[PDB]
Design a protein around this ligand. Structure first.
Ligand SMILES: O=C(O)CNC(=O)C(=O)O
Ligand SMILES: [Mg+2]
Ligand code: NI
Ligand SMILES: [Zn+2]
Length: 331
């Protein structure tokens, strides 16, 4: 068995190997990459996502989210308070202000220490979940707006034709902006490209151990757990690496830098934070190996998780027993 310790693997495809996205994903899995839940892909030196970022300040962040924490430094939830719209140029200036800017630090490890010590005492503003793309239309390799759709994968594997679309999302971050512990909708893959700016630190639990993280989360967030049998779908809970280590939960960590891709694999729980002003692009995708994960994915029916249009068909076809309850949650 490849990668039996579930380490995060880093790949360096050549320009030839970067042509065929599906083939490369299947290669990485042949080497055991999925066992970690997360992999890094460094593009060949010949590749670029677009020519420059000199012209992005006019993108609108219609609903910036202030991420307000409750709890203790290592175990907390965050809620998203909606803020007035602002442009990317306005948001970058805010990120760089004395109130929000990255503190002085020695290296990524020192910054990580400072994040876990101090996150809860601040409320950073995240421009998350913005439909759109920064890849040039002429970029033909690993262009996250030109991937094969999940609907087409389901159709190719299962023969069923369904409604829905699959488009990318932009994320504008600042110091301490946080993504809570989650797997993807329907335990899909994700791919995330860091277009510019400061790094993103990731934490990940191997898919084979995801239920260990779920059991700890039920213990740590007991009221939330009574409220919903899949409350990590709410994407509000944080648990630090120190707390994970104290409770014996297997995990790994890695820092993504500008110009790098990360792939999350089906049922790979992940969480993390931004180091400073940055911009990422991410999308969900599927492969044949996902189908079985999609069939078994948990679902929130309490009403909190509220998701896209396109998840309806996935539930309806892969999980027809759950469909009626899940749809009540959506309505
Ligand atoms: O970048 C972020 O804030 C969150 N991204 C992801 O969870 C992802 O790409 O799967
Ligand atoms: Mg612009
Ligand atoms: Ni994710
Ligand atoms: Zn729920």
């Amino acid at each position: 068995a490849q990668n039996p310790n579930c380490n995060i693997m880093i790949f360096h495809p050549t320009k030839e190997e970067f042509n065929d996205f599906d083939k490369y994903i299947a290669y990485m899995e042949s080497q055991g990459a999925h066992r970690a839940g997360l992999a890094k892909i460094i593009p060949p030196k010949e590749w670029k996502a677009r020519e420059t970022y000199d012209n992005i300040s006019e993108i609108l962040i219609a609903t910036p989210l202030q991420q307000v924490a409750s709890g203790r430094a290592g175990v907390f939830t965050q809620y998203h308070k909606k803020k007035k719209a602002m442009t990317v140029g306005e948001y970058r200036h805010l990120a760089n202000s004395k109130k929000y800017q990255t503190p002085p630090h020695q290296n990524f490890e020192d910054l990580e220490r400072k994040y876990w010590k101090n996150r809860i005492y601040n409320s950073p503003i995240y421009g998350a979940d913005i439909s759109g793309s920064l890849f040039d239309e002429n970029t033909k390799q690993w262009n996250l707006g030109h991937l094969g759709t999940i609907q087409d994968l389901l159709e190719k594997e299962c023969g069923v034709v369904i409604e829905g679309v699959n488009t990318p999302y932009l994320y504008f971050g600042m110091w301490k902006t946080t993504f809570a512990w989650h797997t993807e909708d329907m335990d899909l893959y994700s791919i995330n490209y860091l277009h510019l700016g400061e790094p993103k630190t990731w934490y990940v639990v191997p898919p084979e151990h995801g239920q260990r993280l779920e059991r700890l989360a039920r213990e740590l967030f007991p009221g939330s757990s009574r409220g919903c049998g899949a409350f990590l779908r709410h994407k509000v809970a944080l648990i630090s690496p120190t707390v994970l280590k104290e409770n014996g939960i297997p995990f790994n960590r890695i820092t993504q830098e500008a110009g790098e891709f990360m792939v999350t694999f089906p049922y790979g729980y992940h969480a993390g934070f931004n180091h400073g002003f940055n911009c990422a692009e991410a999308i969900n995708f599927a492969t044949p190996r996902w189908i079985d994960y999609g069939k078994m994915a948990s679902q929130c029916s309490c009403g909190e998780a509220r998701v896209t249009f396109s998840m309806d068909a996935f539930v309806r076809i892969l999980q027809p027993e759950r469909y009626d309850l899940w749809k009540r949650g959506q309505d």
